[PDB]
Description:
The structure is a homodimer. Chain A is globular and about 35 Å long. Chain A has one domain (1-143). Chain A has 7 helices and 5 strands; from the N terminus they run βαβααβααβαβα. Chain A is 43% helix and 17% strand. The longest helix of chain A has 14 residues, at 13-26.
Amino acid sequence: KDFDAFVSYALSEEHLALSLFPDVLENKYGYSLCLLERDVAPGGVYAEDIVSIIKRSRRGIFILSPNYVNGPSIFELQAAVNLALDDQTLKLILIKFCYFQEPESLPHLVKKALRVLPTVTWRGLKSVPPNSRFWAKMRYHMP
Amino acid sequence: KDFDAFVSYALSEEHLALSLFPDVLENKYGYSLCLLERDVAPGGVYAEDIVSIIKRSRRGIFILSPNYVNGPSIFELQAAVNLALDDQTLKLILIKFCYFQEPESLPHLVKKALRVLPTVTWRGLKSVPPNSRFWAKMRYHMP
């Protein structure tokens, strides 16, 4: 394993994933994150790229939103859930970025994980300071 | 390889893939097709299986619709387009099941493939029967 946590995502979601997570967890608290766009080689087969970085990651961190659960992005959480039932060194954490209604024919096991996995509610401006409840819960769930 | 064609999808889109495509191409013309639900053993990683059946397939068949291009199924087509780059034994065909708009955020290679790949139109009751124009074009693009 080569990454503390892999960060999957659909201010904004994108700002929280790509600027805020590495700012706090990497640049301030020294963890080792994986972002698709930074750590993987362009081109390539996206299905393997994710199964690979999942296999080299200690946690999974999923920023849930309506755009996530109704888009192609949900491919990433399914793989994580698949790979997690084989290895439980892999611990998955959801993040409630905003309300999302959950879709109606998500595959069996993805519905299942939504029902039991730990969620940290993202609460906007309050959550942004590095000493916030949000990051506190994030750090608690890191290796 | 070992399959003539892999049939990817998100009456109904599922009836086409699961029922009519075996009825015509498999049964009626003796071809060898791969359906995810039928020809891979359950469990295992969904992203390892689509890459493996694509690698084993002479042809890729993709039933497009808004459901497909806006859901995670869009990653079956993204893999094949990259894999088909490496390997010229793999030829891809697009099926237009019903009108869709090219989603604004597909991977660069997927958008390219929508632009240039051979596209056969599903025309409802007219295309069902074996000697229909849709199956004629289909059998042309088979091995």
